[PDB]
Amino acid sequence: LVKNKCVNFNFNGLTGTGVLTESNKKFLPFQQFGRDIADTTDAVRDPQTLEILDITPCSFGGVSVITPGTNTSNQVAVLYQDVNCTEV
Amino acid sequence: LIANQFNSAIGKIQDSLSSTASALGKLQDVVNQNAQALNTLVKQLSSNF
């Protein structure tokens, strides 16, 4: 298992895409799966090394195109909304 | 006399705001309605339909 990078994981038939990180969520022996308000998984227990992993969906956001009219130029600027200048 | 009444009237506004939270209800309700509407949208993902 690879951590801190967007990966496509499969835990015991549970599939999804997200970033797996170490977590400080204190699970209990009868429970393996954490859960979100919207019923999506939020933490898994590693089936072989029992540490709890956080699942964060890979970074995303809207992309806007800022342009003068094509009656003036064909040059445009791109705004990546609510994202740093690293994931571009 | 008029200037002193004005200065005291402004001072009372500060005392009113600093203690009564309900004074801003017209703006808090707008914030609450949008957050309440958005949370309902999120909860709908948990339904089977």
């Binding site: 999506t40 964060t56 956001g61 | 808090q28 914030v31 958005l38 949208l41 999120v42």
Partner: peptide, 22 residues
């Protein structure tokens, strides 16, 4: 006066500092 599912909030064009200046 006081997420991961495609729901975002856009920032207002007039920042609060500009509102006070007006």
């Amino acid at each position: 006066v006081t997420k991961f599912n495609g729901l975002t909030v856009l920032p207002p064009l007039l920042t609060d500092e500009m509102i006070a200046q007006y």
